[PDB]
Design a binder for this molecule. Structure first.
Ligand SMILES: Nc1ncnc2c1ncn2[C@@H]1O[C@H](COP(=O)(O)OP(=O)(O)O)[C@@H](O)[C@H]1O
Ligand SMILES: Nc1ncnc2c1ncn2[C@@H]1O[C@H](COP(=O)(O)OP(=O)(O)O)[C@@H](O)[C@H]1O
Lengths: 54, 374, 54, 43, 374
C-alpha cells in the first residue's frame, strides 16, 4: 500500500472522485466516436472549414 | 496517433484539468493557485520550498498568500503560468512534453498578443512537437453531440455567450459579461458580514467558496422566496467550519446567485444573463433564430446551481416571441465538458492536419498561430 | 470648592480645553447653518431621501 | 459665424475637417467659491 | 430650553461625546470605560462602589481592571453599555432622556442585530420619544461643507472609507478595515518590550496610549528616515512615567504609525489605508472619479498623527494616474467632526420627518430601524 496510485486517491477531494465515477459510468467520449454519422459529419465540417482557411 | 496520444490540457480560470486524448476522464484536476509563504520559518530541517503550486498550496492555506495567475480571463503573470504548466506536465502526469502533442483551449475573444505569447512559451521552453488552440465554448457543443446551437459559458474568469452554426463561431454576436464565480464569492462575503461572520484573508476565500458550492440554490420567484424566508426558519441550514465553529447561513442561500440575474446588486450597470442570451440571439439573422431558441446548451462551473435550469427556461420564455420552441439542454457533467470536447476533437483522423510543426514555428515566428488557426 | 463648575475646571485636562477653544473659535455649526444656500440645499436633499426611501 | 459653427459641430461628430478657426472656442467649467467649504490646506 | 432640543451622541470604541442640537461644542467628552475593583478593600465607612464609570474610572486606574464595552466597533457587553449611557444622560448632561429626542451614530458595515439592540434598550428603558441612527462617515462630509467626496474615518475601533456622490452614499463601494488605534497601541507596547521597558496591565496600556498620543509622527519616507535614525541620535525623546522614571523611546516614534500603511508588521493580510481608498475609488464609476480625487477628507482620532497628510497624498498620488489632481482635506478639528455633522443633521427642518416615533416602534417592533433608517 505504498504505490502512488493509492497516494493520489486519498489526496483526492471526495467530490472530484465522485465526479470521476459518474463520468466514468457516463462514457461520453466513447459514444461520440462510436456513432458513424455524427463522426463523419464533424469530420466533413472541420475538413472543409480547413479547406476554406487555406 | 497510435503510439502517442495528444495531451488535452484545459486551462480554466479557477481550475486546471489534464489528461490523454481518447480517454473518458482527465487524469488530473487541480486548483490553479500559487502560494508564497508569509511568515518566517524557524524549523531548520523540515524543508520549505520557495513557493507551492496547486493542491500542495491549497493543503497549507494558513501560511500562504494565494495568488491566481489568470485574472478575469486575462493572464497577468506569465512566469507564474510557466510554473503551473511545469507542475501540470512533470508532477501531475509524469510525462515529458517533448514526446506528445498538446491541445490548448482559450476564451472566444482574447488579445492577439496573448495567443502569440502562449505559442512562444509552448514552443520555446517546453519544445513540444505539435500544439493547437481551440475556442473554449466551441468544444462544449462538440461534447453535446451538436453542431448548431447557442453556448452559454460561465467560469471563474468571465461569462460569455456565443452562437455556433455548423461549427462556425459568429464573431459579431459573441457577448461578454463580468459575472463570474469569484464575484459571487465576494458578494457572499459582503452579505455574510450582516449576520456577524467576518472573513478577510485569502485563506478564508476558499472556505467561502466551499460554502457557496455546498449550500446555495436559485429561487424560481425571488419576491415569494423572501417572504417565505422571513416567515419561517425551515430554509436555514448549518455549516461546520474548519476550526469547529458552526454558522447558520439562513436567508442568503438564494441571495448569492441572484446577482447573476440582477447585476444591480453588485453595482454593475449591465443587464442580466437572460437578457444577454436574448440579445445574443437577437443579433443574428432571422433564419437561424428558430434553431437557436430550439437549441440551447448550458456549460461552465457556475451553471451547476440547483434550480438554475427552470429559472433560465422561465426567464428566456418571458423574452421570447409567442408560440416559440424553447428548451434548455444542460448535461449533468457540464463543467467537465470542455475537456471532453477537446479529447473528442483530438481523437479524429482528419484533425491531424491541424497540428503546427516545430519547423513551421521556427520559420514563421510566434505569429503563425493566427494564420494556421483561424 | 464644592461648586460643580469649579470641579469642572479642576478635572478636565489641558488638551480638552485646547480643543474646546479651537472649535469654539471657528464656529463650524453656525457657519453651516446661517448660510442660506448650503443649508436649504441640504434641506432639499433630505427631502429627496424621504421621497426615495419609501 | 454660421460656417464656423457648422464646422465645429461636424468636428464634434468625429469628422476630420481642415477648416481652421478665426475665433477658437474656450470651454471652462469655472468654480464658485463658497465660504462654508473648508480649504484644501495642502503643501 | 424653551423648546425641546435633540441630543447628539457620538459613540465610538474609544471615547463618548455628547451635546445638544445646534450647539457649537459637545458638552461632555469622556473615555468609554467601565472599571471594577480587583484588590481587597478594607476601609469601612468610606467611599467604595462596585463599579466605576467614565472619567472617574480613569482617575483611579491603580485599583481597577479597565474594560472597554465596545470592541472593534461592536458592542459586546450590553450592561456596561447601559451604564455608560446612564452616566452620559444623568451624570454629565443632567437632562432626562424622555423630554428630548436622541441621535446616534454607528459604523457603516456591522452586524444587523446590533441596530435592533440599539433600538430595544433605547425605547424600552430610557423612554425616549424618538431617535435616529446615521452612518458616522457621512457626517464628516456634511461638517466639512461638501456634498460629494470620499471620506476616510479611522477611529479607535475600526477604519472605513466611503465615497459619497451628490450627498447620497454608495453602498457597494464601502471598504472596511479592522485596523485602528487600539491595535497601534498594542503594537507599540509589543515593540517597546525590545528596549527593556515592560507594560502588561490595563493601566500600562493607558500609559502607552498616552505615550503614543504625545510622541508619534509619520515619516515622509520610511527608508530615508530609518537611515537617518541609523546615522545620528537627534530622533530621541524622553518621556517621564507617573512613577518618576524617564524612558527614551527614540527610533519607535515613526514605526508605530507605519503599521497603518504597512499592515504586514502585524501579520494581517490586508494592505495599507492608501491603497484601500484607492480601491474604493476604483470600485466607483469612471465619470465620478475626478470629483473623488479632489475631495478626499480625513477624519477620526487616528488621523491626527503629524505628517499624515503629506504621506497620504504622496502615496495616493503614486497610485493615481498622472493626469489627475489630488487634494487632501485635513480639518484642524477632525477628531470631533462627526459630532459636528450630527449637530447639522439635528437642526434641519426636513429632518423632523426623519424621526422614528415611539408609536411607530410600538407598532412595528425593533425591526423598524432597517426600513426607517438609511
Ligand atoms: N458542484 C458545484 N456546485 C456549485 N458551484 C460549483 C461547483 N463546482 C464548481 N462550482 C463553481 O464553478 C467555479 C469553477 O469554474 P470552472 O469550471 O473552473 O471555470 P473554467 O470554465 O474557467 O474552468 C468555482 O468558482 C465554483 O464556485
Ligand atoms: N492627537 C492625537 N495624536 C495621535 N493619536 C490620537 C490623537 N488623538 C487621539 N488619538 C488616537 O485616536 C483614538 C481616539 O479616536 P476617536 O476619534 O476618539 O475614536 P471615536 O471617536 O471613533 O471613538 C485614541 O485612542 C488615540 O489612540
Amino acid at each position: 500500500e505504498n504505490n502512488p496510485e493509492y497516494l493520489r486517491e486519498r489526496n483526492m477531494a471526495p467530490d472530484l472522485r465522485q465526479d470521476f465515477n459518474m463520468m466514468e459510468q457516463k462514457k461520453r467520449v466513447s459514444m461520440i466516436l462510436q456513432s458513424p454519422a455524427f463522426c463523419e459529419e464533424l469530420e466533413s465540417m472541420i475538413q472543409e472549414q480547413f479547406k476554406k482557411g487555406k | 496517433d497510435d503510439d502517442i496520444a495528444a495531451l488535452v490540457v484545459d486551462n480554466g480560470s479557477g481550475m486546471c484539468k489534464a489528461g490523454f486524448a481518447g480517454d473518458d476522464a482527465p487524469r488530473a484536476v487541480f486548483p490553479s493557485i500559487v502560494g508564497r509563504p508569509r511568515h518566517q520559518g524557524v524549523m531548520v530541517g523540515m524543508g520549505q520550498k520557495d513557493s507551492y503550486v496547486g493542491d500542495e498550496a491549497q493543503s497549507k492555506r494558513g501560511i500562504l498568500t494565494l495568488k491566481y495567475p489568470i485574472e478575469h480571463g486575462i493572464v497577468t503573470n506569465w512566469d507564474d503560468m510557466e510554473k503551473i504548466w511545469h507542475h501540470t506536465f512533470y508532477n501531475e502526469l509524469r510525462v515529458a512534453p517533448e514526446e506528445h502533442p498538446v491541445l490548448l483551449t482559450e476564451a472566444p475573444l482574447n488579445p492577439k498578443a496573448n495567443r502569440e505569447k502562449m505559442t512562444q512559451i509552448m514552443f520555446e521552453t517546453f519544445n513540444t512537437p505539435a500544439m493547437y488552440v481551440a475556442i473554449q465554448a466551441v468544444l462544449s457543443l462538440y461534447a453535446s453531440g451538436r453542431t448548431t446551437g447557442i453556448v452559454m459559458d460561465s467560469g471563474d474568469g468571465v461569462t460569455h455567450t456565443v452562437p455556433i452554426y455548423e461549427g462556425y463561431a459568429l464573431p459579431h454576436a459573441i457577448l461578454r459579461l463580468d459575472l463570474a464565480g469569484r464575484d459571487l464569492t465576494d458578494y457572499l462575503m459582503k452579505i455574510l458580514t450582516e449576520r456577524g461572520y467576518s472573513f478577510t484573508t485569502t485563506a478564508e476565500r476558499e472556505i467561502v467558496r466551499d460554502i457557496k458550492e455546498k449550500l446555495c440554490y436559485v429561487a424560481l420567484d425571488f419576491e415569494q422566496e423572501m417572504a417565505t424566508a422571513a416567515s419561517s426558519s425551515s430554509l436555514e441550514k448549518s455549516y461546520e467550519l474548519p476550526d469547529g465553529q458552526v454558522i447558520t447561513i439562513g436567508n442568503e442561500r438564494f441571495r448569492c446567485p441572484e446577482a447573476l440575474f440582477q447585476p444591480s446588486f453588485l453595482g454593475m450597470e449591465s443587464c442580466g444573463i437572460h437578457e444577454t442570451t436574448f440579445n445574443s440571439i437577437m443579433k443574428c439573422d432571422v433564419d437561424i433564430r428558430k434553431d437557436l431558441y430550439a437549441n440551447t446548451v448550458l456549460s461552465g462551473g457556475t451553471t451547476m446551481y440547483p434550480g438554475i435550469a427552470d429559472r433560465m427556461q422561465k426567464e428566456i420564455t418571458a423574452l421570447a416571441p409567442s408560440t416559440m420552441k424553447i428548451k434548455i439542454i444542460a448535461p449533468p457533467e457540464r463543467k467537465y465538458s470542455v475537456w471532453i470536447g477537446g479529447s473528442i476533437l483530438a481523437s479524429l483522423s482528419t484533425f491531424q492536419q491541424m497540428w503546427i510543426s516545430k519547423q513551421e514555428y521556427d520559420e514563421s515566428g510566434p505569429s503563425i498561430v493566427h494564420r494556421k488557426c483561424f | 470648592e464644592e461648586d460643580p463648575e469649579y470641579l469642572r475646571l479642576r478635572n478636565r485636562a489641558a488638551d480638552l480645553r485646547q480643543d474646546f477653544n479651537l472649535m469654539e473659535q471657528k464656529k463650524r455649526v453656525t457657519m453651516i447653518l446661517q448660510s442660506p444656500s448650503f443649508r436649504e440645499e441640504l434641506e432639499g436633499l433630505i427631502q429627496e431621501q424621504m421621497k426615495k426611501g419609501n | 459665424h454660421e460656417f464656423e459653427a457648422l464646422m465645429r459641430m461636424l468636428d464634434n461628430l468625429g469628422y476630420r475637417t481642415g477648416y481652421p478657426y478665426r475665433y477658437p472656442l474656450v470651454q471652462e467649467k469655472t468654480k464658485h467659491k463658497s465660504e462654508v467649504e473648508i480649504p484644501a490646506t495642502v503643501t
